[PDB]
């Protein structure tokens, strides 16, 4: 809280955090697409998809 | 000089006193486009019957050599001999091919020829990739139209034939109004006409069947992928010009601009072809060539290539099609000047080779469409008259944003989808 309850020290640090975290999500999405690229997407049949690929 | 007389059958002759051989032949205006998917391969079977062991033996006893050629628009049967014996070739052609066909269509001979042709077609379909890829390109370009039937015939259809199909085809297509009698080498036109007149040499009545559908081009592709082969073979083409088009020679020159390339010959790496500047660095291909093929109803303009770089196919196709794009907008005069002389030498060897069989085939196939044979000299002036504006006008019509046909086999997994290739036919920067 930065104090004894929710007051000025709370909101003023909640906003500066709110501007930061989306830049962390954007960095985790980059790491999220890095783990998606090693093996690729799946298909609804649940079987191998390496036989028929399109760009 | 080329001399043609319409008396009797259309008789064409090209005299060359220097040659030590003479060819006499018959060229028919029917080909693999005159047959249907159920008797496909009847022309090849007729060819192999004319080339059978007994017929060839009786021919070679007199001292004669037999040639047969099957194509989309004509069938050629040629007898070649020494200049003194040119009259004997007519006698053999009359006695064997024309007058009687019962002996050649016996049961045992037909079965043996059928089994040999089946073996040949079976070997072709599995162990000859660059040519069967071109055959599939034809079959996918002109599908459901006469021009797409393979000239050798399919394996499944060749089994169903009997002698009845052969004799029916002979009745329907071997006619006086469909035939040209050709003479090449050391023979005179007057002597040839006199020799024909002494005999009857009548083929049949006439009125060959007329096809109900004219050949049409469809943008399409066929992929025959096989991962047990070491390379990938690819043939790509667009619609071209037919025979008797005003833009025939412009088409051949535009083809000659890009030419052919072999990676292992040291000289062909120094050619003025600018395309090589993009290919040579990463060894994209082993060989390529460019073609402008013309038929009676339509044509094909494109290239064919083979490569072991199975991971860089799209780069090869991309660079080739960007070189094609350059024709419409920014072709330069030096390119055309080099192309003129390269084409003239290219046409020069084709029409002026020593072997008279090629001359006979060309003259017979030419007079069956044009009605006369263009001279070598008049060919050059049209070649020399070609300018940059003509090349741009032809390219803006025939290959700018036009449908394509593709056929490939082997490790063609790197070959991208159809649309990605189709989009490369324009630049989008112009
Ligand atoms: C997500 C989008 C993915 C799009 C992929 C794509 O278009 O790839 C085609 C294609 C695939 O590459 P390629 O054909 O193998 O090699 C490049 C070609 O040689 C490229 O050569 P090109 O001559 O075929 O095309 C060159 C291209 C290059 O474009 C630019 O440089 C722009 O020039 C233009 O597009 C000029 C017209 C631009 C009009 C823009 C209109 C206003 C917006 O790439 C391009 O041609 C690039 C086009 C990019 C256009 C802008 C895309 C949006 C940018 C934000
Ligand atoms: C901004 C947030 C996110 C973005 C932009 C994102 C983007 C993507 C993309 C582009 C793919 C590949 C395409 C697809 O499968 O549809 C993917 C796959 C996947 N994502 Fe996400 N994702 C996000 C959040 C999440 C979350 C929150 C989860 C799980 C709680 C998740 C789990 C997955 C899984 C399991 C796959 C694989 C699906 C498959 O291959 O069938 N993602 N993601």
UniProtKB/Swiss-Prot annotation, chain A:
Protein name per its UniProtKB record: Cytochrome b
Chain ranges on the Mitochondrial matrix side, renumbered to this chain: 40-55
Role noted for this protein: Component of the ubiquinol-cytochrome c oxidoreductase, a multisubunit transmembrane complex that is part of the mitochondrial electron transport chain which drives oxidative phosphorylation.
Binding residues for heme b b566: 32
Family, per entry: Belongs to the cytochrome b family.
Coiled-coil annotated residue ranges, if any: none
Gene of this entry: COB
Binding site for heme b b562: 18
Sequence positions that bind a ubiquinone: 37
Subunit record text: Component of the ubiquinol-cytochrome c oxidoreductase (cytochrome b-c1 complex, complex III, CIII), a multisubunit enzyme composed of 10 subunits. The complex is composed of 3 respiratory subunits cytochrome b (COB), cytochrome c1 (CYT1) and Rieske protein (RIP1), 2 core protein subunits COR1 and QCR2, and 5 low-molecular weight protein subunits QCR6, QCR7, QCR8, QCR9 and QCR10.
Compartments, record wording: Mitochondrion inner membrane
Transmembrane region(s): 8-39
Note from the entry: Heme 1 (or BL or b562) is low-potential and absorbs at about 562 nm, and heme 2 (or BH or b566) is high-potential and absorbs at about 566 nm.
Curated annotation (Swiss-Prot), chain B:
Subunit field text: Component of the ubiquinol-cytochrome c oxidoreductase (cytochrome b-c1 complex, complex III, CIII), a multisubunit enzyme composed of 10 subunits. The complex is composed of 3 respiratory subunits cytochrome b (COB), cytochrome c1 (CYT1) and Rieske protein (RIP1), 2 core protein subunits COR1 and QCR2, and 5 low-molecular weight protein subunits QCR6, QCR7, QCR8, QCR9 and QCR10.
GO molecular function terms attached to this record: metal ion binding; metalloendopeptidase activity
GO CC list: mitochondrial inner membrane; mitochondrion; respiratory chain complex III
PANTHER family: CYTOCHROME B-C1 COMPLEX SUBUNIT 1, MITOCHONDRIAL, METALLOPROTEASE
UniProt xrefs under InterPro entries: Metalloenz_LuxS/M16, MPP/UQCRC_Complex, Pept_M16_N, Peptidase_M16_C
Pfam families: Peptidase_M16 (PF00675), Peptidase_M16_C (PF05193)
Role: Component of the ubiquinol-cytochrome c oxidoreductase, a multisubunit transmembrane complex that is part of the mitochondrial electron transport chain which drives oxidative phosphorylation.
Membrane topology: Peripheral membrane protein
Any one of the GO BP annotations: proton transmembrane transport
Subcellular location: Mitochondrion inner membrane
Keyword terms: Electron transport, Membrane, Mitochondrion, Mitochondrion inner membrane, Respiratory chain, Transit peptide, Transport
Record's protein name: Cytochrome b-c1 complex subunit 1, mitochondrial
Note: Present with 19300 molecules/cell in log phase SD medium.
Family: Belongs to the peptidase M16 family. UQCRC1/QCR1 subfamily.
